[PDB]
């Protein structure tokens, strides 16, 4: 029985972000090239899934964050975490 | 407790996709930049991992499927989801 | 039981990962455009996940193992696995 993750990464630095799935809420942890440090993304969740993808330098994520049939977008566009538009029927 | 989700992004648009494996089938929600919708995608499955690249505008998609110890991959080229090549010995 | 995957690509052959936790052990499946073969990882995990990026032609991996609350981070950057600063308190 075991802690879950995903994990995304973008630019040569490079960038990355690793979120955990611990007893029903989901943290992160991030890399810019100088360490390890706890990152702002804080949501319920006992599954977690991100994708990420560049506009030019601007970093865009997406984390999908489950809970019993209930999956919840949250997304990064360079300023804070947002509700996304995500729906599904489960 | 919880379904299961993998997501992969491409372009600036972006276009996601979410696969979510819910009680031993996985299911696939798509954007495109215009709403959510449900894929074509459907296959068995109690786990689910994605991978993707483009060529030029030309997405190619690779969902990974498991149940017990068989994965199977699935394979879009824009041509619909086909059989692909991945065996493993689990 | 059902085993548990995660999936990364690069390039556009493309070279294609598949890291696979099965009774405790993490293992890798890998295609670079001949046929599916067995790579080197292989470590202690009960859940996995994956990234990649290119640095011109050489590509950088990160797995992420977790067995409980520990999440391990395994390196590849062009000569062989190596454990990786990555740290939590799970
Ligand atoms: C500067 O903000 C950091 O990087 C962003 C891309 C997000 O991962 C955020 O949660 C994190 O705190
Ligand atoms: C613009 O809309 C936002 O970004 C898209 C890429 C999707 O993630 C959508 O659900 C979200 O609300
Ligand atoms: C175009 O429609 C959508 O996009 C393809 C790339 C696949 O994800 C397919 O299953 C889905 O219906
Ligand atoms: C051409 O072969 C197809 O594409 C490769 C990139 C692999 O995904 C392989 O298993 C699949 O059958
Ligand atoms: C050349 O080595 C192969 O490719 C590397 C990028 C790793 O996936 C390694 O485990 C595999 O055996
Ligand atoms: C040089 O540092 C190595 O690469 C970074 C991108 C991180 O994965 C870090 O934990 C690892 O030790």
Redesign the interface.
Known sequence: ????????????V?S?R?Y?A?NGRITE?C?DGK??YTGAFNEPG??????????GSAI?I?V?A????T?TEWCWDGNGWTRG??????
Not at 1 to 12: L, R
Not at 66 to 69: K, P, R
Request: hydrophobic share 35%; charged share 5%; aromatic share 14%.
């Open positions: 029985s075991s802690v879950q993750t995903a994990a995304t990464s973008w630019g040569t490079p990355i690793v955990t611990n942890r890399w360490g390890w006992d599954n977690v899934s991100v994708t990420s993808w560049l506009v865009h997406r999908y489950s809970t019993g049939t999956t538009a995500y729906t599904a029927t489960n």
